[PDB]
Design a protein around this ligand. Sequence first.
Ligand SMILES: N[C@@H](CCC(=O)O)C(=O)O
Ligand SMILES: N[C@@H](CCC(=O)O)C(=O)O
Ligand SMILES: N[C@@H](CCC(=O)O)C(=O)O
Ligand SMILES: N[C@@H](CCC(=O)O)C(=O)O
Lengths: 255, 258, 258, 255
Amino acid sequence: AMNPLVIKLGGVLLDSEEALERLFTALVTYREKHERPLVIMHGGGCLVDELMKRLALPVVKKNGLRVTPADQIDIITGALAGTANKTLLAWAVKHQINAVGLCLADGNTVTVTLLDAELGHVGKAQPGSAALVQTLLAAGYMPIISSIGITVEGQLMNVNADQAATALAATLGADLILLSDVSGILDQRIAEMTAQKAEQLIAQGIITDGMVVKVNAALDAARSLGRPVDIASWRHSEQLPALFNGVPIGTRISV
Amino acid sequence: AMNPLVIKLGGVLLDSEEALERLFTALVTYREKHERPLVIMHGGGCLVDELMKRLALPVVKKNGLRVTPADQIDIITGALAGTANKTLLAWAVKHQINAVGLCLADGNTVTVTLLDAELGHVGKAQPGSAALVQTLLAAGYMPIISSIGITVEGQLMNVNADQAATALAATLGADLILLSDVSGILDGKGQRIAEMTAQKAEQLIAQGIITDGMVVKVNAALDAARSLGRPVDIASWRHSEQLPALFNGVPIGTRISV
Amino acid sequence: AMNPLVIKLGGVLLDSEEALERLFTALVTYREKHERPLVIMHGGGCLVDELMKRLALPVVKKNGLRVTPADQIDIITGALAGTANKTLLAWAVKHQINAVGLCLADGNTVTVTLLDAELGHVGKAQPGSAALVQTLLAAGYMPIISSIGITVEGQLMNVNADQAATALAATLGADLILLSDVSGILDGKGQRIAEMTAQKAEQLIAQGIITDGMVVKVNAALDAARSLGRPVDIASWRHSEQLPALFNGVPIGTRISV
Amino acid sequence: AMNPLVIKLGGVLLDSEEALERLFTALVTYREKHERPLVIMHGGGCLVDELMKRLALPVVKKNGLRVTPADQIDIITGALAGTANKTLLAWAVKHQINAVGLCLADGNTVTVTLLDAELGHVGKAQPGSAALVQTLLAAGYMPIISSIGITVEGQLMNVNADQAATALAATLGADLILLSDVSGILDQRIAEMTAQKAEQLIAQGIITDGMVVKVNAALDAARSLGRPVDIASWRHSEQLPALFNGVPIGTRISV
Ligand SMILES: N[C@@H](CCC(=O)O)C(=O)O
Ligand SMILES: N[C@@H](CCC(=O)O)C(=O)O
Ligand SMILES: N[C@@H](CCC(=O)O)C(=O)O
Ligand SMILES: N[C@@H](CCC(=O)O)C(=O)O
């Protein structure tokens, strides 16, 4: 496994000091043996949701999926591009990993447009320019990228982190891991599946009540990329270095 | 002027779209004709204290420092490293300046340690490694740096933006401009002094011409100039038609040395 | 609605020309169709703390109160009673609303006493005499009142704008709107409650749905409603197309009672 | 002396706790005997100048007379319409005088336009509407009016207090006293003079080095009004009640 890897961290992972220690130890153990370019991408866990509750900011929704009003985007930018990003940076510093925090707009890494006027400040991700990240990687830095972007006209955008990760991996030609609390799908574990097989198992109610959402997100990413994406958990962390080297320790969704 | 230049933004700049539009129009005007490496350094503004009030969190500021308790540092990091930094970044994009948001810990650019345990999460800045920023500058990016740092042990630190600006300038071999509402120092015929030494400043303080809050401001500039071992400019954002010249080395406010 | 109405402006309103333009466009829209007596009540905003920083003066805010030392009260009175009040007045003129700037001492409208000597010049508000404001209203002026008061002994007092708004409303027999960034209270399905009693609020606090800073905000509203013995509206300035309806009595945010 | 009186307070008067106690005692002693409508008008003494020094704000000047830049008008509004106005209010409260603080823009009492683009936020005063003040007077309030106005387009203006006082007295049909530290002009005191006589005495160097400025201001006011204006000092304060009743205790400049 030469060739860059985007590791996208899920909400429940960021909410967990336990998980972060394991993830960051895993990054260290991996780096001692291998030398593949690594990029972290993240959204925001409960840090965001809890702050918004404190500020009486509702989780609005126009027939489906979240709305980010004018009066929320600054606060969210803060929790997400600020608190979450710099928390992960603090973890990198703690583990002596030279890391640089970025958001999507830095170097126009992932271009963002207005998804829909009625959802407010939500961005649609699409591949941007690889130069900035390539420069940082070649200089020995691990970028840690948040899922906040900026439109070309200067407006801050809250972007689905999964979609951001997909646009990033396409920009970089990177593999993609969506790391969360879902270890893998069973039927006896399933190491590889096509996206269509994953849809089938959902359709026939094999894939677990809560966490259809996690497989749907992997399978969308796989199809957007035209190549496979890994789902994996932080739980069995002694296995994370093998994952970062290409081993599907959880479930690979192929296309 | 061919040296790298650190431009430090005072609070009022971040609090006002007029001020930001003037600042950024000036940056574009200057980069049309000049290519000297530019770095923006900034602190918080009104928005941290707005947010503290919204969350009914206490505020204690003394001697230029905000007591920053364990239960406030994340929120503060959010407002500074997040909202402020990304707002500035959005201004850059809107003006087609290829910028990159950093904080002090990125690349160990400015090293920070715990200043004093009774202030909570407040950092002492010192010069770190120039490598990261030098790489960004050489590739044509204008870094925009917030005044949040991280200790070697992984603790988030709220750092005084003036001191962080100084540590940064020292790291970069850069000149330094402290941009705020203060245009310059007056000489008690009420006239602006273009170039002021430390000796002139003492004279003015001893004589009671520079008084109160100007004393603090003038000392912050002098402490900057002494650390850097070269002069530091003080200027206002108001006459923004003059700012390109300032960025090209003309002391439009007060230049402080010695 | 035919009762007099006190509209209390939260800090963020004064800090932003967009917010002021929305507020004042709403006031004009409302006065086109409705003639109910309107009074504006306001505190400080960002500009007091900007000014404290410019003068390198210390800041201690706790429990909704700023410790206001003898050597700060004049400056603070300047920023609140002066700059803020007159800025609002200028917005009125610009919108052709015949307004009149007052403070709490004018006509003994809201009586103030020393709250607590260790807070320095901080006032406790209580209802005073309605005569002055009633005279201005009956003559067609929209009073704009700052939250500075004066003790019977002639000392200037910095007063919490929420408490002053309450004392004012009580004096005037007026309804009360606390306008800020808070749009309403959420019920922990995340939905806005149009009408909330004290009992509902306790339930939400006991259950940990209203938490932290919302607790303080909700208590400030409840303390207002208990003093006045009638409900108090909480709303945001954001959807300013809804504000005329709010001023005409529709609870567009959360109405608080009991 | 029926008919309103504007008492304009000079800088050095506001700077002096001594002077204010005397002025306010004088207002009380006068009110016990007489019932003439009284209006106070003021600028700002050292309160303004000292604050501006603290803030490194220069006293600019374009060939003559002060400039009020964009970056000064808020701070000045604060010291002047705020601190100075409410200080005088505190004095009224201390002496149980029902008083109301106002600025020029309140009720469009004194209309203000841009004097000159190059002086920045300096206003030219001119008579406005008497209604608001008349209403307050008829209701038993003593207005205390600061020399800050607002243009019709919403811009704050720093206005010469003497000129403001003149525009006010014309608006109200009031007599006018410019109260300061100059007790009166000698040659043996002079109780009445025409403005032209006052110019003559200046011209021939009889009228004292410093305080030509104070006589010039009275004589300009007199001519603008087309009727007399009093100069008087707070010093001999047992004489101030007679002044407020019409007695020229200092020097009247006639026209
Ligand atoms: N951190 C969450 C949501 C963050 C986001 O998409 O903005 C996740 O990716 O599972
Ligand atoms: N609240 C920060 C502000 C950073 C700055 O503006 O200097 C401090 O006192 O450390
Ligand atoms: N600094 C004032 C603010 C007035 C207000 O906004 O409520 C206080 O705490 O009393
Ligand atoms: N208070 C001073 C000057 C104030 C002003 O004109 O603004 C005076 O009238 O003598």
